[PDB]
Each structure stands twice: as C-alpha cells, then as structure tokens.
Amino acid sequence: LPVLQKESVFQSGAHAYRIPALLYLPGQQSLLAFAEQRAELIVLRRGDYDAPTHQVQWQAQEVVAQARLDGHRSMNPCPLYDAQTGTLFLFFIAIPGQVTEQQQLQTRANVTRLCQVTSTDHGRTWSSPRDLTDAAIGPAYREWSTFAVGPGHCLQLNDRARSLVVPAYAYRKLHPIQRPIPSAFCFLSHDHGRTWARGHFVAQDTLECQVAEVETQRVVTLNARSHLRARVQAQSTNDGLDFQESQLVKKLVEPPPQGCQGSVISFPSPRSPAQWLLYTHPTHSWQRADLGAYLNPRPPAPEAWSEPVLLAKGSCAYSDLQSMGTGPDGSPLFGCLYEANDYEEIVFLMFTLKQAFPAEY
Ligand SMILES: [Cl-]
C-alpha cells in the first residue's frame, strides 16, 4: 500500500532496540516513540507532525532517565495520555539486574515491580519513579513468578470518570512443579491513577495484550497473544474488571508455538457503529513476518475482521498503533511503530485509512 512515511527511528545491528510503544499527543500534534535499549533502560524520540510536509520530524533519541529503579532493568514501556488533565503516564516494569538473595532460595520468587513516571510538560521532563506494585497488585503478588504491562499504549475510557485501563499479564504459580502459566488481565483506575483495581484473568496461556473501547453500550475489548494458531479476544462490560468468555479469533492468525505481540486501537467510524478497530500483527501462519493491518467495522465481533493489508514484507515482530487525527487526504491518519529485520530496527510507518483500505473509498 502507499504510505505517507516510512523510516527507521531505532537501529542496532546488535538488536539493542526492542519493544516499541507509541503515543500521540492530540494538542501538540506530536508522537512519543519509546523502546527498550539493551542495564536495560527505556529510550524515547519525540516527533512533531509537520502539517506543511505531512511528515513526522523525529528529534534526537534520549534516555528516560527517571524511568528506572536503582539496580533494576526497565522494560515494557506502556504510555498513556490523560485527556482530562493533559498529563502523560509512562508505566513500565522493573526487574533486578542480577539474581537476588530471595531468588537464590526461591527460584520463582516474584521480584518484579510495576512503576510509573508522569509528565506535565508533554513528555519533555518526567517525575521521579513511583512504585505502584503494592497498591495495584496487593496480596496476589506472591502468587505470581513475574508479570508485565503492555507493551505499547494503554487506554483511557470515554466514561464519566475518564478511567485508565492498563493491559497486563501475569505468570501464575498454580502448579508447584509445572511452569507458571501466563494469563492476561487489566488494571483499572477511575481517579487518574490515584487508586488501582486488578481485574480478573481472562483465559489461561494468554500473554501480551492491548485493550480498546468500542460501542456495541461501551465495552472494553482485550486482544491477546496466545500459543495457539489464532488470537484470543474477550470483552468486558465493567471497564475490564471482569471479562466474558474468551474467544479464538480465527481471522487473526498467530504463529505457533510462541505467537507474537500485536496492537489494537479504536477510531471513529468513517461512516452504524460509533467506532471501528484497527489491528496490526504479522500475517504469516508460522513465522514473524509480513506485518499486516486489519480492520473491524463491527467491533468487536470476531467474524467481522477484514483480510489484512500488507504494511511491510519480510521480518516483522511487535508493533504499536496510534490514531493521529485526520490525514491530508481527509481520512483517519495512523502511526505504527514496529520491530523489523530480525530485530535490527524499529520502523515508523504513517498512513491513512484511505491508503490502506481504498475499497472503503
Ligand atoms: Cl497534547
């Protein structure tokens, strides 16, 4: 398909950059591109949408120095823009850089921390890190071996409270001998991050997931990575606290046996339903290759997913999507950050709905 922009924003022959996260700032009309740099830290590149040239002008890479705990590796950048306050949240995971004394005695001891840094100046400067572990997870902490959030952008609902929903997953130590099994879930806050609730797990063996909100009443749809041949999806009518039965979305392939992370976002319908969904993920049946974009015009119905349009041929892995307002051709504008070329780079792609799905126009 034709695109407005395609450029590598992170590159490393040593596969130093992985796990992309993209965040669009609607007022500034800018993007924040985050990635993990292998202790492991989170880096960022700011990019302004230059209307006159309809191109994002990426600035110099910088380390998010605040997004780190002493003696810990930082990973899984999970950004969010709070439309009510304008504040930016960068949630992330912190794990000890070396085996701890506790782990020497208990191999599966949980030593993973949930953290956040916030910005009130559009991401130029960040607050000192805040450890949300105890407040968000509580007594369930010891029942897991580790957990993570995202990766990729989180969600803010259009409910009265403008609730924050952070997609996550935990490796549950259910069997003393058998390896911990991961299950996806959501963290939910109705007060802009002051308090948090941990939602119930969806089906077992679900990893990295992302959530979006759509009209159908408003529901939260969770799209997760699986070890099966298809993606796993579930919907919640209570902001992610409880999900209805998980479903296999056969139209969205997953390459076994490991699967791959994918991204999903909602955007205003270009036409009965209020929102449509756009999702990106590799399209090869058993390899992480051929990144494709899929559309769901009647979300989140599993059977409504479109055939994918190829965004990039070849090696492609993890990706993150963001809607960026209206494009130069009048149709919705999108930004996508994805891993490519055997993890040697993270590429930024910008395209419109009209470019990707011409049949719609
Ligand atoms: Cl903004």
Q: How far apart are CA 188 and CA 166, in angstroms?
A: 7
Q: How far is the CA of 87 from the centre of ligand 1 (A)?
A: 9
Hey, what amino acid is at 133?
T
Q: Which residues pair with 220 in a beta bridge?
A: 213, 236
User: Which of 18, 76, 78 lies closest to 317, judged by CA?
Assistant: 18
Q: How far is the CA of 348 from the centre of ligand 1 (A)?
A: 20
User: Which of 336, 260, 265, 254 lies closest to 300, judged by CA?
Assistant: 265
Class (C level, CATH) for 1-361: mainly beta
Residue at token pair 């099966």: 228
Q: Is 288 annotated as a binding residue?
A: yes
Q: Is 142 annotated as a binding residue?
A: no
Q: How far apart are CA 81 and CA 24, in angstroms?
A: 8
* DSSP secondary structure string for all residues of 60-85: --EE-TTS--TTEEEEEEEEEE-TTT
Q: Is 225 annotated as a binding residue?
A: yes
Structure tokens at 52: 């006159």
Around ion ligand 1, residues with a beta carbon closer than 5 Å are 25, 27-28
Q: How far is the CA of 344 from the centre of ligand 1 (A)?
A: 31
Structure tokens at 89: 């949240």
* CA angle at 274 for the pair 189 and 168, rounded to the nearest 5°: 30
Residue at token pair 């963001």: 322
Q: How far apart are CA 357 and CA 354, in angstroms?
A: 5
Grouping H, G, I as helix, E, B as strand and the rest as coil, residue 75 is strand
Question: What burial class does residue 178 get, using C-beta atoms within 10 Å of its C-beta: 0-12 exposed, 13-18 middle, 19+ buried?
Answer: exposed
CB neighbour list of residue 264: distance below 8 Å, 6 or more residues apart: 210, 211, 212, 221, 223, 277, 278, 279, 321
Q: What is the resolution of this structure in A?
A: 1.5
Report CA-CA distances (Å) from 136 to 102, 113, 131, 187, 213. Answer: 22, 11, 9, 7, 22
Q: How far is the CA of 86 from the centre of ligand 1 (A)?
A: 6
User: Which of 252, 261, 216, 251 lies closest to 235, judged by CA?
Assistant: 216
Hey, what amino acid is at 81?
Y
Cβ proximity of 1 and 310 under 8 Å: yes
Specify the pairing of strand 72-81 against strand 62-63.
unpaired
φ/ψ of residue 107, rounded to 5:
-50, -40
How do the domains of the chain map onto residue ranges?
Answer: 1-361
From the CB of residue 287, how many other CB atoms can be counted at a distance below 10 Å? 12
Q: How far apart are CA 96 and CA 75, in angstroms?
A: 11
Find out whether the peptide bond into 20 is cis, omega within 30 degrees of 0. Answer: no
The last residues before gaps in the chain (C-N over 2.5 Å) are 38, 216, 271
Q: Is 254 annotated as a binding residue?
A: no
DSSP code at position 260: -
Report CA-CA distances (Å) from 293 to 304, 351, 356. Answer: 14, 11, 8
Report CA-CA distances (Å) from 360 to 182, 271, 282. Answer: 38, 10, 22
Structure tokens at 90: 């960068």
CB neighbour list of residue 289: distance below 8 Å, 6 or more residues apart: 282, 283, 313, 314, 315, 316
Grouping H, G, I as helix, E, B as strand and the rest as coil, residue 139 is helix
Q: Active-site residue numbers?
A: 318, 339
Report CA-CA distances (Å) from 341 to 75, 120, 288, 289, 315. Answer: 21, 36, 10, 9, 5
Cβ proximity of 208 and 223 under 8 Å: no
Q: What sections of the chain are H helices per DSSP? A: 101-105, 133-137, 353-356
Q: How far apart are CA 220 and CA 210, in angstroms?
A: 10
Hey, what amino acid is at 109?
A
Q: Which residues pair with 280 in a beta bridge?
A: 263, 293
Q: How far is the CA of 131 from the centre of ligand 1 (A)?
A: 25
Question: What burial class does residue 146 get, using C-beta atoms within 10 Å of its C-beta: 0-12 exposed, 13-18 middle, 19+ buried?
Answer: middle
User: Which of 191, 44, 175, 68 lies closest to 130, judged by CA?
Assistant: 68
Find out whether the peptide bond into 300 is cis, omega within 30 degrees of 0. Answer: yes
DSSP code at position 277: E
Report CA-CA distances (Å) from 285 to 247, 337, 338. Answer: 19, 22, 18
Q: Is 73 annotated as a binding residue?
A: no
CB neighbour list of residue 208: distance below 8 Å, 6 or more residues apart: 148, 150, 151, 169, 184, 224, 225, 261, 318
Hey, what amino acid is at 20?
P
CA dihedral 222, 223, 226, 232 (to 10 degrees): 80
User: Which of 240, 239, 248, 139 lies closest to 203, judged by CA?
Assistant: 248
Question: What burial class does residue 164 get, using C-beta atoms within 10 Å of its C-beta: 0-12 exposed, 13-18 middle, 19+ buried?
Answer: buried
Torsion sign (Cα): 277, 279, 285, 290: positive
User: Which of 30, 39, 34 lies closest to 10, judged by CA?
Assistant: 34
Structure tokens at 110: 């949980």
DSSP code at position 99: -
User: Which of 143, 124, 236, 220 lies closest to 183, judged by CA?
Assistant: 143
Q: For the stretch 99-116, what's the b/e string if a residue is b when 16 or more beta carbons lie within 10 angstroms of its beta carbon?
A: eeeeeeeeeebbebbbbb
